[PDB]
């Protein structure tokens, strides 16, 4: 149901929430996981849009701050859960049986709210346009399992 690289993104989302001392796995950690996974279609699409790993790291830490103490427990936020649910819908609508990193990215953009939306807004990203651009990239490339 998830590609191998989508599984890596979900691991890195949790990794980053712990590393930063946060008790939630939110949309901002999903975004960090997408860019830091560094190999999947989402990382390549984010990079094509001028959204690099170090920039996103700086924005999250600036907007939220660090917990100065690695967190003890971590649970997904309601919005992050909705992003993952939307990623399954996005994969379906594109004719994919497996949810890839790009479908998590499209779900995040489609949700269009939460901390990740503020990070993207700080980098001058219009979510509608980014959605259009991601879909243009997927329509230009073979991305099947």
Residue whose structure tokens are 């997408």 = 34
Query: Which segments of the chain does DSSP mark as H helices, in order?
Result: 4-19, 27-37, 41-48, 53-64, 78-93, 101-111, 114-122, 127-138
- Applying CB under 6 A, does 85 fall inside the site for ligand RPI? no
Closer of 75 and 129 to ligand RPI (Cβ): 75
- Which of 9, 129, 107, 8 is closest to 116 using CA atoms? 107
Phi, psi of 52 (to 5 degrees): -90, 160
- Applying CB under 6 A, does 59 fall inside the site for ligand RPI? no
- Applying CB under 6 A, does 101 fall inside the site for ligand RPI? yes
Residues between 2 and 31 that touch ligand RPI (CB under 6 A): 3-6, 24, 26-28
- Applying CB under 6 A, does 98 fall inside the site for ligand RPI? yes
Burial of 34 (0-12, 13-18, 19+ CB in 10 A): buried
- Applying CB under 6 A, does 82 fall inside the site for ligand RPI? no
- Applying CB under 6 A, does 61 fall inside the site for ligand RPI? no
Distance between CA atoms of residues 43 and 31, nearest Å: 10
Which residue in 46, 80, 119, 134 binds ligand RPI (CB under 6 A)?
80
Binding region for ligand RPI (CB under 6 A): 3-6, 24, 26-28, 40-42, 77, 79-80, 98, 100-102, 114-116, 143, 145
């Amino acid at each position: 149901r998830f590609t191998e690289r989508a599984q890596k993104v979900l691991a890195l989302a949790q990794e980053e929430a712990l590393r930063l001392g946060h008790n939630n796995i939110g949309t901002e950690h999903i975004l960090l996981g997408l860019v830091r996974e560094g190999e999947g279609i989402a990382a390549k699409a984010l990079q094509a849009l001028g959204l690099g790993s170090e920039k996103i790291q700086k924005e999250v830490e600036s907007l939220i701050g660090r917990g100065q103490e690695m967190s003890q427990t971590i649970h997904y936020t309601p919005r992050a859960k909705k992003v993952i649910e939307l990623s399954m819908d996005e994969a379906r609508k594109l004719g994919h049986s497996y949810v890839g990193t790009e479908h998590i990215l499209l779900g995040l953009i489609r949700e269009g709210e939460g901390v990740a939306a503020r990070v993207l807004n700080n980098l001058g990203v219009s979510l509608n346009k980014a959605r259009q651009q991601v879909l243009q990239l997927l329509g230009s490339n073979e991305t099947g399992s």
